[PDB]
Amino acid sequence: QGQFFREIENLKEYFNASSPDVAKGGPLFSEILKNWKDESDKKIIQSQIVSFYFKLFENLKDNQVIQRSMDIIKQDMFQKFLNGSSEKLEDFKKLIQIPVDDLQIQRKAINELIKVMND
Amino acid sequence: QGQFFREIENLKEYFNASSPDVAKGGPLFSEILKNWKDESDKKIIQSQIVSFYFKLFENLKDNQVIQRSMDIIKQDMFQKFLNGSSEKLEDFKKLIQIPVDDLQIQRKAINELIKVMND
């Protein structure tokens, strides 16, 4: 099923705004997302393109205008990321922005071993 | 396997700078990253944890005292989440954080739906 089809995507024209350029000022994310999942050593990118999409709806608050549905598409990103378990939740709001003193703690700096190690 | 740290991890001691021994009436770092990986179904944020990191070393540039470090430390990290292909390096420069108009051309927000199936 290609599901939530017709009413939410429907308003994508709500973010495209007042008529119709093909987003024609620059061949951009068309250029970005070109060949991407290419070959089974993927993971990375898909998750992050999805990070700015996430700061996309968070930034666009226009309360009546689309707002409820940015929330409705951003909600299903869940299933785009992981959403197997509840804790998927926690981390992203964490995964927000602005480092502050109180969050430029870097001590646990070394941390990174744990991944590619695991034979 | 993965010793190379002798002169490089030794630098973390140079970040900390002058002293006390425990970075702060924190637990924070500790309370932060404790049980994350607990369930290997969540690949995703591991990439982003290292992103603030990219948001740290690309923030300090300490002139031959700490620079080289951050240089050296900054590098090893792609090799953690993804040393898989040559490409992704590019894919980060974009990932800078500040999307300055003419750069948040959200037209395309609509295609990533595809991760939907994958198999």
Min Cα–Cα distance to chain A from B61, Å: 15
User: Residue A33 has what DSSP assignment?
Assistant: T
- Please tell me which of the candidates A12, A44, A113 has its beta carbon nearest to residue B2: A113
The count of other CB atoms within 10 Å of the CB of residue B55 is: 17
Chain B, residues 1-40, CB within 8 A of chain A, namely: 1-2, 9, 12, 15-16, 23-24, 26, 28-30, 32-33, 36-37, 39
Asked if residues B41 and A82 have their Cβ atoms less than 8 Å apart, the reply is yes
* Alpha-carbon gap, residue B62 to A54, rounded angstroms: 33
CA-to-CA distance for A104 and A106, rounded, in angstroms?
Answer: 6
Contact A43 B82 (CB under 8 A): yes
* Rounded distance between C-alpha atoms, residue A94 and residue B32, angstroms: 10
Amino acid at B97: Q
Longest dimension (CA), chain B: 53
CATH top-level class of A1-119 = mainly alpha
Phi, psi of A113 (to 5 degrees): -50, -55
Domain boundaries, chain A: 1-119
A49-53: long-range pairs with CB below 8 Å, 24+: A49/B112, A50/A77, A50/A80, A50/A81, A50/B112, A51/A95, A51/B48, A52/B99, A52/B104, A53/A77, A53/B109, A53/B112
Instruction: Determine contact, residues A75/A91, Cβ cutoff 8 Å.
Output: no
DSSP characters over A41-104: S--HHHHHHHHHTTTHHHH---TTTSTHHHHHHHHHTHHHH--SSTTHHHHHTTSSS---GGG-
B84 touches chain A (CB under 8 A): yes
- The experimental resolution of this structure, in angstroms, equals 3.0
